[PDB]
Structure 1
Amino acid sequence: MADEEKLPPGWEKRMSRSSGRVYYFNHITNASQWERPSGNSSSGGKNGQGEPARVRCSHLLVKHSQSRRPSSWRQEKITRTKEEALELINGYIQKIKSGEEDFESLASQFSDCSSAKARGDLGAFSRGQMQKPFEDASFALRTGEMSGPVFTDSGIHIILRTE
């Protein structure tokens, strides 16, 4: 229902008798209960809530010289410089966003991470499972959107929300 973000006439916060519990009471009708009552006026319905508890996104890991662990099935000692790093991730954004290089086949062929198994597609996860910057950017993008260069533990990652 309404977003109840106020206290109209009659409603007043009070503490329990000789106690320390705080509640809400309305003298207009002598009401008494927890949680906010109304929302100033009366009519309210500008809420939302809900949203999917999980999301399906794909990504492309491209370690660099500053990678905490420059090594994977793609290479033994990764050392992608600043330009080399973004050069890959960025270039990948162009082709993919253009529809020439499918992120799926793209990530896999360049997925420095074990994501290759799913061509970068990490699958349906829950907000708070993957890296903080990952989840945020991931959960911050729209359906079919691709994130930019994300510098995390390994290196630069590119996210692409599927659904």
Structure 2
Amino acid sequence: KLPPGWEKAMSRSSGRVYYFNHITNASQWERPSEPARVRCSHLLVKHSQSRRPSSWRQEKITRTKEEALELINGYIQKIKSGEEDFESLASQFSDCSSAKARGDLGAFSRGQMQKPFEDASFALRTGEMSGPVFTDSGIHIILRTE
């Protein structure tokens, strides 16, 4: 059983089993449920070692790789608690011009995007969200919408 990328793991804090996906970095307590194109939105947090350390949000991005991951982790927490919607955080805080479209990148096939982004995107099922996804652009949260 278990769809591509998914494995079982042991919770250190609680001792209960959980499920993790080494392609998307998703993790959840619940046991989880190839197309030519997928459609995804993302939220990007850049850092000082990004291929290009600037965005519409700030001309010189100075945060560390570690501080970017903490920001990503907090947004995932907010999304999973329902305190904030993915689209609302992407629109406010994503370091990419796709923020203006609620993070939507449109449809794409394999062979177009950065490879880690592509692999995570195609390993999500429609409606699912990734964990932190690392590319030279920075750290992404990816939501598969189609």
With the length of structure 2 as denominator, give the TM-score of the two structures.
0.71
- Of the structure 1 ranges 24-33 and 113-122, higher mean CA displacement relative to structure 2 is found in 24-33
Length, aligned pairs only:
146
C-alpha distance 33-79 of structure 1, shift in aligned 2 (>3 A): closer
Change (3 A) 1:20 1:132: closer
Asked if 1:65 corresponds to 2:48, the answer is: yes
Per-residue CA deviations over 1:54-110 (Å, capped at 9, x if unaligned) read: 111111111111112111110111122233111111111111122221111111101
Q: C-alpha displacement at 1:142, in angstroms?
A: 2.0
Decide whether the 8 Å contact of 2:44 with 2:140 is kept in 1: yes
Tell me the TM-score normalized by structure 1: 0.64
Identity of aligned residues (%): 99
Query: 1:87 and 1:114 mapped to 2: Cα distance?
Result: 21
Choose 1 or 2 for highest CA Rg. Answer: 1
| Cα-Cα RMSD | 16.7
- How much has 1:128 moved relative to structure 2? 2.0
Q: Deviations over 1:98-136 (max 9, x none)?
A: 222111111110110111121111122222211111111
* Mapped contact 1:107–1:120 kept (Cα < 8 A): yes
**Greater relative CO, 1 or 2 (CA 8 Å, sep 6+):** 2
Name 1:7's counterpart in structure 2: 2
Flag structure 1 segments of 5+ consecutive residues without an equivalent: 1-5, 38-49
1:111-130 counterparts in 2 under 5 A?
111-130=94-113
Where does the alignment leave 5 or more consecutive residues of structure 2 unmatched? Answer: none
Note closer, same or farther for the CA distance 1:69–1:23 as it changes in structure 2 (3 Å cut): closer
Q: Which residue of 2 aligns with 1:158?
A: 141
Equivalent of 1:132 in 106, 109, 115 = 115
Of 140-149 and 54-63, deviating more is 140-149
Displaced runs of 4+ in structure 1, greater than 6 A? 6-37
SS state at 1:156 partner: strand
Residues 26, 129 of structure 2: 8 Å contact kept = no
More off after superposition, 63-72 vs 20-29: 20-29
Whether the 8 Å contact between 1:111 and 1:119 is mirrored in structure 2 is no
Change (3 A) 1:64 1:142: same
Pairing partner for 1:108 from 88, 91, 98? 91
Q: Structure 1 residues 36 and 85 mapped into 2: Cα distance closer, same or farther (>3 Å)?
A: closer
Q: Secondary structure at the match of 2:12?
A: coil
- 1:54–1:86: structure 2 CA closer, same or farther, 3 Å change rule? same
Residues 15 and 51 of structure 1: CA distance in aligned 2, closer, same or farther (over 3 Å): closer
Change (3 A) 1:65 1:54: same
Relative to structure 1, is the Cα distance of residues 128 and 91 closer, same or farther in structure 2, using a 3 angstrom cutoff?
same
1:136-155 deviation line (CA, Å, top 9, x unaligned)? 11101122222122221221
